[PDB]
Amino acid sequence: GSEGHRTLASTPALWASIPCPRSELRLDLVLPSGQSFRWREQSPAHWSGVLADQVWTLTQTEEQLHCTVYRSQASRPTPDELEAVRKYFQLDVTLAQLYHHWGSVDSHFQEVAQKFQGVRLLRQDPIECLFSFICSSNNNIARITGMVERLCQAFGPRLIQLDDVTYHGFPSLQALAGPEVEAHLRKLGLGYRARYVSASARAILEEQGGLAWLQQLRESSYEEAHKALCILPGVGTKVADCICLMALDKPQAVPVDVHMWHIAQRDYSWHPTTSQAKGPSPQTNKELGNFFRSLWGPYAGWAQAVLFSADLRQ
DNA sequence: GGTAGACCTGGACGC
DNA sequence: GCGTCCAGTCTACC
Ligand SMILES: Nc1nc2[nH]c(N)nc2c(=O)[nH]1
Ligand SMILES: [Ca+2]
Questions:
Q1: A118/A21 Cα distance (integer angstroms)
Q2: How much distance in Å is there from the Cα of A133 to the middle of ligand 1?
Q3: Cα A71 from chain centroid?
Q4: Residue A34 in contact with ligand 1 by CB distance below 6 A
Q5: Which residue's alpha carbon is at the smallest distance from atom 5 of ligand 1?
Q6: Which nucleotides of C are covered by protein (CB under 7 A)?
Q7: CA-CA distances (angstroms) from residue A21 to A45, A118, A127?
Q8: Counting atoms of ligand 1 from 1, which one is nearest the CA of A136?
Q9: Positions of A marked active-site
Q10: Alpha-carbon distance A194 to A116, whole Å?
Q11: C1’ B7 / CA A192, Å
Q12: A191 CA: nearest nucleotide by C1'
């Protein structure tokens, strides 16, 4: 009982709650949907992963989000620690207000959103988000998840061990810039993205001024941020958009992938207009992004997450 | 400025 | 069982 991944039932005294209705968040729809790749449902309806340099397990009831953290004497999450979670899930943003608005201007959204509530955006660490999505290009969520895992296991700080699972913090820039990192990543199966991670780690550290350069984009403008990211190797329109949206507070950023193209064509009968090409291309992708923004507004990136997540459930 | 394949790696087909 | 197909970014021309 004292060992292994905790459960709300097995270690009651070891869980603190946070007011949060299923309407505001659905762990099962958010955590495995390709925003963050480091959450695993170790026990049914119980998700474990690293949050703010500590390992947590989370599970929810109808109106509560149950949180438990592994740090020395096993205690309960403190009010400050719970605050780290509220920030991770950006709980100050009311999902119901957004859903209402989107559903109100988009018929199709209302339709889909009635069966997929609780899909919101995680507020992620810039570095993890950056490299995690560099590994996402021309790839599938299942594969990306393993790559990210092995990556953290090889270059990330070892945290704690639950059962046979050893958790690691996300690798530092210096670590990812180290010697022979690409080669090691290749043996780890990242394919040609091994070089991207390495190259981008070094470019940021030995050309852009380092971490301060990234962290600073949060205050910059979507246009600026997205522009600056494409500098980095392996970071194109999509990855840049994912980073802006998921880690830089750019809620209007709309990543364009295979899923968003299908959704556009199938549910909106969309077609590029200002672009002569009628298939994916730097031009058409850019236009699609604008179309969704024009369609959903300032939080288009969040609306996009709802449909994207629902489109995975096929 | 705007299109072609080429591209690591498996799960999933189709044959 | 073996050969496609599929889940973005970059480069080589046009
Ligand atoms: N459009 C889009 N593509 C994605 N890829 C991954 N991995 N996550 C997303 C997402 O949220 N949106
Ligand atoms: Ca594709």
A1: 8
A2: 9
A3: 23
A4: yes
A5: A34
A6: 6-10
A7: 15, 8, 30
A8: 7
A9: 238
A10: 35
A11: 7
A12: B8
Report DSSP letters for chain A, one per residue.
--SSS--TTT-GGG-EEEE--TTT--HHHHTTSSS-S--EEEETTEEEEESSSSEEEEEE-SSEEEEEEE-----PPPHHHHHHHHHHTTTTS-HHHHHHHHHHH-HHHHHHHTT----------HHHHHHHHHTTTT--HHHHHHHHHHHHHHHSPEEEEETTEEEEPPPPHHHHHSTTHHHHHHHTT-TTHHHHHHHHHHHHHTTS-SHHHHHHHTTS-HHHHHHHHTTSTT--HHHHHHHHHHHS--TT-----HHHHHHHHHHH----SS-S--SSSHHHHHHHHHHHHHHH-TTHHHHHHHHHHHHH--
Q: Which two tokens stand for residue A305?
A: 């997450």
Is residue A289 within 6 Å of ligand 1 at its C-beta? no
Ligand 1 atom nearest to A141, measured from its CA: 7
Length of chain A measured in residues: 314
Question: Given in angstroms, what resolution was this structure solved at?
Answer: 2.3
Q: Which domains does chain A have, with CATH numbers?
A: 1-89 (3.30.310.40), 93-113+254-312 (1.10.1670.10), 125-250 (1.10.340.30)
Method of elucidation? X-ray
Of A56, A29, A42, the closest CA to residue A121 belongs to A29
- Residue A193, CB, strand C, below 7 Å: no
Q: Which two tokens stand for residue A172?
A: 């530092």
